[PDB]
Amino acid sequence: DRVKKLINSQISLLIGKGLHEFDSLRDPEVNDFRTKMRQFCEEAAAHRQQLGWVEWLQYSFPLQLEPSARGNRALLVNVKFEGSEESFTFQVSTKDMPLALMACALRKKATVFRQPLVEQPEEYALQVNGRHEYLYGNYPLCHFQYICSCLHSGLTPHLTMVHSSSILAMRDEQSNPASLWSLEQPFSIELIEGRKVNADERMKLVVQAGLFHGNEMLCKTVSSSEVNVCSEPVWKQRLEFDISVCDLPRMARLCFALYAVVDCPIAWANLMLFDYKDQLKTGERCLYMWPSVLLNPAGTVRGNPNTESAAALVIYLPEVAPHPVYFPALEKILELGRHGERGRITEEEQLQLREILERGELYEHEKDLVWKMRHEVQEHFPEALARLLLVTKWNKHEDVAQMLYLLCSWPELPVLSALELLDFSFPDCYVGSFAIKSLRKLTDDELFQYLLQLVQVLKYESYLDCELTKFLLGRALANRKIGHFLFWHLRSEMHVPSVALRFGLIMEAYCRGSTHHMKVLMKQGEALSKLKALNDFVKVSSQKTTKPQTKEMMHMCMRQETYMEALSHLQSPLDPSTLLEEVCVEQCTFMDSKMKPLWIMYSSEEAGSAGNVGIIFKNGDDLRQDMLTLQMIQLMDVLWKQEGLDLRMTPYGCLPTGDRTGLIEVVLHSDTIANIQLNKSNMAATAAFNKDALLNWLKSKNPGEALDRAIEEFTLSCAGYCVATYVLGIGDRHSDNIMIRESGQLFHIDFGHFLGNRERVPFILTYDFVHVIQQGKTNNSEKFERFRGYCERAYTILRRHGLLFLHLFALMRAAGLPELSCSKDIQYLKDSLALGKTEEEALKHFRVKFNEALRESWKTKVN
Ligand SMILES: COc1ncc(C2=CCOCC2)cc1S(=O)(=O)Nc1ccnc(C)c1
């Protein structure tokens, strides 16, 4: 009671919505979700409380491995022991396991402390200094993301030997405190009246209505009669749909659209015909409609929360029986579908099936053949499940029972196929459950890669308690990195009234499961409060006083006790492994752009060089599209690295955290092309020609022999971003949104416009980069053509995984991004990846675009 009331107020602050509002609804669906999901999450917290010390490391500090390891050389390593400032530098091989390194550290400890030790290497974990990152398991050193980054950057790994008893003390510290088919009457509803309708009084009001099973219409859309415009329109009329009440599928939704005629659209509404407990809905309903900016089937089945102004359509769902009618059980359904005649198929008719299954829209007579051959499909082409599901007649219960009988015997599908089955175009709760079963095999690394999309799938759900929510909640409770990000993906959409109820409930369920992680997340949101307040002080001050004056005004504001306490010693929302220890106030600043984004610098004494990190607080712009583009780029880099192609990419973090608010990870020792190209006086890189400025900057940052590898880092990262921006249609590319690292790595920032946005983005080649690739020479086709090979290679690797990109982009349509909503945007990708052509055909096409970019590049060399 004493702690439960505090935990409840902590949860409420964390999610920015009071838990009392959930109870004020008096909603049974909400209440049952809160009881059931708190049971599931506390069970998980208890399971975690007893975990072994190595399993607790797997929960808190999951391994960050290189993509090639997933599923030789000398190396200097510095190792200290927890509780001592003394350290030991020693040489190891890139192929040695952490155990060998730990055993070597223990021998070099026994020889200094003159004592034959009791502790063994098996009792220790290697922590990365000043990070929530560990090195454990049977993997060679080079296979870890930390050691791998240290070899490229030439840096020395600094590890700490943490004992098993210390790891177990962290676990203890973070403890949680103690029958339908008989009804053959046509489906009908009574459109009674409307409220708060704001429309043109010269026009008349109409109510269109469709019956949907996801994207497909169950029957033709019906329309209401015209009634003069006013705040309270009255109809009191019965609308009949060409479908039997027995034929209505389980996941069927009634979609409404209120509009004016002489074509101004006013509002929309949806609802499920079956409630969460499978009962057919009866009685009067008040539908608080959403404003339209015609019928919207993919829209939310929950009403508009603002009842103080939303227009409300009043409907009556008739009583089709004297008793409540529930949806038949799986046992009753499987028996109907179990009986299903099998006919013999011709060998000439079997050639037509194998061709269209491997070929993708179908013709009317081909669907007839796909359905007839459903049994041969299940047993020889099980990967064609989604084609068959689309040919099934969801408005004819005999077909649906027959399909579900095959589904329950269907072999498990590869992850790529399951991702397709999560699309709104497959709304059956059993299809969704078969897809989740096939996704259970996803590794925590694959899960995390597609986590963003899986969160958008939750918006397509028809009911609060679903298999996907339980799967995502179960994975978040067993891996703290997944839990961290799943929290921030939901927390960032709390300002959207259509998703606030579901996301606030899922966040509450997680907080029951991890009380310690709630405190860690609160500390992060508290920092975000102070950052918003400090960015507001800057947004105002910057437009009166000069940039250097506003900087010391910001620095004094940051030096207040409330700021110094809130902004220090927290986990980075961008990376849970990165600890943000001491704010370096004098190092902080802000951009002179419209939204004045804050650049907050941090340092750590325990972490050293790796502890010096930056975060950019952005308020005013929507960070969702950058986050998606960056994840897509990082996916391309994982795909390329899996084929042994490392193109030296820079997928920095970017996380939306609230309404037009979010963080971006600063990439240090990097500058924009525009700033290097300023060609300033008295500095190192000043050149005779501007085409040299960038190569002279690389020359000053990488002296002598370092330059040759800096040019190769540039070439590889160039080839990678040329392909990525081409495939993704990233336009609006200029010198101020292209940055380069002191290492030679080139990268892109400011991903506001992608997928052509409506024009087709060509392949781009800047001659300023071509000059760096050619090592400052006018003609160097040896180096230039290596670059063209790196490009062709990168492009062909991505095409082999084009379906993965298409399925992921299809799931992202749920997010509501203005430049990603319909098939028109997904078309840009099929064109850029040339997915309908053969490899030699698509490479030939790609070669033409690269040559066309080269002709465009010579138009600036000749000048
Ligand atoms: C879209 O906005 C951003 N995107 C990325 C960065 C980064 C920078 C350096 O490290 C990797 C991240 C920063 C921002 S920003 O600071 O909000 N905007 C900028 C616009 C143009 N030029 C600059 C230097 C910044």
- Measured from the CB, is residue 384 less than 6 Å from ligand 1? no
Structure tokens at 287: 């539908």
**8-state DSSP, 384:** G
Residue nearest to atom 7 of ligand 1 (CA): 666
- Strands of 598-741, DSSP E: 598-604, 608-619, 654-658, 661-665, 670-672, 738-741
Q: Rounded distance, CA 140 to CA 827, Å? A: 43
| CA 808 to centroid of ligand 1, rounded, Å | 26
Residue nearest to atom 3 of ligand 1 (CA): 750
CATH number for the domain whose boundaries are 186-317: 2.60.40.150
Cross-strand bridge partners of residue 259:
206, 265
Q: Rounded distance, CA 215 to CA 252, Å? A: 11
From the CA of 747, give the closest atom in ligand 1.
11
Crossing angle (nearest 10°) for helices 624-642 and 802-812: 160
- Measured from the CB, is residue 664 less than 6 Å from ligand 1? yes
- Measured from the CB, is residue 666 less than 6 Å from ligand 1? yes
From the CA of 618, give the closest atom in ligand 1.
17
Which of 768, 780, 794, 796 is CA-nearest to residue 687? 768
Its sign, for the CA torsion 297, 303, 305, 308, is positive
| CA 675 to centroid of ligand 1, rounded, Å | 13
From the CA of 650, give the closest atom in ligand 1.
11
Which of 509, 419, 499 is CA-nearest to residue 459? 499
Query: What H or E segment, with its residue span, contains residue 508?
Result: helix 500-513
Q: At 702, phi and psi to the nearest 5?
A: -135, 85
675 contacts 686 by C-beta, under 8 angstroms? no
CA distances from 341 to 68, 209, 335, 402 (A): 49, 37, 14, 10
- Strands of 262-356, DSSP E: 265-272, 283-288, 290-291, 312-317
Residue nearest to atom 6 of ligand 1 (CA): 749
What is the four-CA torsion angle of 821, 822, 827, 833, rounded to 10 degrees? 40
- The experimental resolution of this structure, in angstroms, equals 2.5
Which of 588, 591, 677 best tests ligand 1's pocket when mutated (most atoms within 8 Å of CB)? 591
| CA 616 to centroid of ligand 1, rounded, Å | 8
SS3 track for 417-441: HHHHCCCCCCCCHHHHHHHHHHHCC
Q: Are strands 74-81 and 158-163 parallel, antiparallel or unpaired?
A: parallel
Q: Rounded distance, CA 98 to CA 124, Å? A: 10
Name the H helices within 295-363: 330-338, 347-358
Q: Rounded distance, CA 270 to CA 257, Å? A: 9
Which of 515, 517, 513, 518 is CA-nearest to residue 43? 513
DSSP string, 647-686: -------EEEEETTEEEEE--SSEEEHHHHTT--SSSSS-
284 contacts 315 by C-beta, under 8 angstroms? yes
CATH of 330-519, one of 3.30.70.2660, 3.30.70.380, 3.30.470.20, 1.25.40.70: 1.25.40.70
| CA 670 to centroid of ligand 1, rounded, Å | 11
- Measured from the CB, is residue 667 less than 6 Å from ligand 1? yes
Q: How far is CA 243 from the centre of its chain?
A: 39
| CA 748 to centroid of ligand 1, rounded, Å | 9
| CA 749 to centroid of ligand 1, rounded, Å | 6
204 contacts 260 by C-beta, under 8 angstroms? yes
| CA 261 to centroid of ligand 1, rounded, Å | 47
Q: How far is CA 832 from the centre of its chain?
A: 22
- Measured from the CB, is residue 591 less than 6 Å from ligand 1? yes
CB atoms within 10 A of CB 788: 18
| CA 547 to centroid of ligand 1, rounded, Å | 18
- Measured from the CB, is residue 749 less than 6 Å from ligand 1? yes
| CA 592 to centroid of ligand 1, rounded, Å | 11
Q: At 825, phi and psi to the nearest 5?
A: -75, -45
- Measured from the CB, is residue 65 less than 6 Å from ligand 1? no
Terminal alpha carbon distance of the chain: 78
Specify the residue for token string 């138009």.
859
| CA 750 to centroid of ligand 1, rounded, Å | 7
